Design a protein around this ligand. Structure first.
Ligand SMILES: [Cl-]
Ligand SMILES: [Cl-]
Length: 469
């Protein structure tokens, strides 16, 4: 008899989201091992009949073979997550029908998956919403694909200004934020806290203009994106991901820029001890430590500002001492409220969360902001009470490699002289520390000081700044 085990070697089952997820992944590992053992070439493997036989062979090998499958799953934590969704899943129901849900909890230092929520109740709906279902990640794409890359490239710092003035998509349509067409200039912090869309649009466009290899960043984290030219990419246009894969992106940011490939199987052994499969760690420095730690500090305020999620109020009430852990995160909402995301990290763990409907109809406007935040608060609390130390009490901290620059609040660039319609202005005002991930830090204020903006935009903005000099 073959066995699937938890982390510590305790038996899950003999050979139900846990059972089917670990079995399916084991069968794939078995498939690779069997074809290779039998000396089936890559070419011969392309044959569909041959693949089908190897798939069935791998299923039967496990059924009949006395293998020992070691998963990364933590029994107490994963059970605690199953009770949480059993008891609190109803808190997701917002009057748009039964709301489905997936969650994955990942170790930031290993990529190991400690537990997950596959859905509301397997017996009623078997779709696996943590590992199988793929949905746009919406604005939780922004830190990874837009701001994170721009900072890593030395194109921005923590207090850099971006344009949120009105602008249109390639196709003539205005870039919206709910019903707002934009405002004026803002800091990176404001744009992140609020999730304003235009600053994210400008940031990606600047990457494209500079020929930045964004695909290199993304593929190192395991993302599959077919077209990188999509203007709404930072807002999750043209990207669809599982919760497990998306958790892996957040893991990378949390682990100070070092990616660890997600996994639920750590090892398969034959009864006699032969190693059929074993997970091999391949760490990759996707973002510099400077960039990741700068991003941690930005995402920390996303949650504590409470603009797009009530999470920190919810968790404070349930477990004030856990709420005092060093939580960072980001929310996303798709264009017709079809999918909501909340991504959460502490220095030690990352928890990803999606809610949505199997047939894609809309949720309520508040489903993410309020319902998923409260549910995720409960989820996080259940995990802690199952395993008191798992989230940890460590703080995210700026890497020493970080360069600090003294910049104008107004421009996010160092004080100096700028040509404003002929007349040379000496530009002054209140200053602030801005964090950078390059050698030299912030530049001195240029005329086009912000990320994005039209000539008309800068005329307006500069009019304001001189007005107070
Ligand atoms: Cl580094
Ligand atoms: Cl609140």
């Amino acid at each position: 008899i073959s066995e699937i085990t938890y982390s510590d070697g305790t038996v899950i089952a003999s050979i139900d989201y846990l059972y089917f997820t670990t079995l399916a992944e084991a069968q794939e590992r078995m498939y690779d091992y069997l074809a290779q053992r039998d000396n089936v070439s890559a070419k011969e493997l392309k044959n569909e009949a041959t693949q089908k036989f190897y798939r069935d062979l791998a299923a039967k090998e496990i059924e009949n073979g006395g293998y020992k499958i070691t998963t990364t799953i933590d029994q107490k934590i994963h059970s605690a997550m199953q009770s949480a969704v059993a008891d609190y899943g109803y808190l997701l129901d917002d009057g748009t029908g039964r709301v489905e849900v997936g969650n994955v909890l990942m170790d930031n230092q290993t990529g190991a998956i400690l537990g997950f929520v596959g859905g509301r109740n397997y017996q009623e709906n078997q779709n696996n919403h943590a590992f199988d279902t793929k949905r746009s990640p919406a604005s939780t794409t922004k830190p990874l694909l837009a701001y994170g890359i721009a900072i890593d490239q030395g194109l921005m710092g923590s207090e850099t200004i971006l344009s949120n003035y009105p602008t249109n998509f390639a196709n003539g349509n205005p870039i919206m934020y709910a019903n707002s067409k934009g405002t004026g200039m803002m800091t990176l912090g404001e744009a992140l806290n609020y999730s304003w869309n235009i600053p994210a649009y400008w940031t990606y466009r600047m990457l494209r203009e500079n020929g930045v290899d964004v695909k290199g960043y993304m593929e190192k984290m395991g993302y599959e994106i077919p077209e990188y030219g999509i203007e709404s990419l930072p807002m999750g246009g043209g990207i669809e991901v599982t919760v497990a894969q998306h958790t892996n992106g957040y893991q990378t940011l949390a682990n100070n820029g070092v990616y660890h490939q997600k996994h639920v199987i750590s090892k398969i052994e034959a009864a006699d001890g032969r190693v059929v499969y074993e997970y091999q760690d391949k760490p990759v420095q996707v973002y510099s430590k400077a960039t990741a730690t700068i991003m941690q500090g930005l995402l920390r305020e996303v949650l504590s500002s409470r603009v797009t999620t009530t999470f920190k109020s919810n968790l404070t009430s349930l477990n004030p001492t856990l709420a005092n852990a060093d939580w960072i995160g980001k929310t996303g909402t798709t264009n017709q409220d079809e999918n909501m995301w909340l991504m959460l990290s502490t220095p030690r763990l990352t928890l990803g969360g999606w809610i949505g409907h199997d047939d894609n109809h809309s949720l309520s406007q508040q489903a993410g902001y309020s319902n998923n935040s409260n549910y995720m608060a409960h989820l996080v609390n259940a995990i802690q009470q199952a395993s008191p130390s798992i989230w940890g009490n460590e703080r995210f901290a700026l890497d020493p490699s970080v360069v600090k620059s003294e910049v104008l609040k107004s421009t996010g660039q160092k004080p100096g002289k700028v040509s404003v319609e002929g007349k040379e202005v000496e530009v002054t005002g209140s200053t602030v520390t801005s964090y950078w991930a390059n050698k030299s830090g912030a530049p001195a204020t240029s005329y086009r000081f912000a990320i994005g903006g039209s000539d008309a935009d800068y005329q307006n903005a500069w009019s304001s700044i001189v007005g107070s000099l």
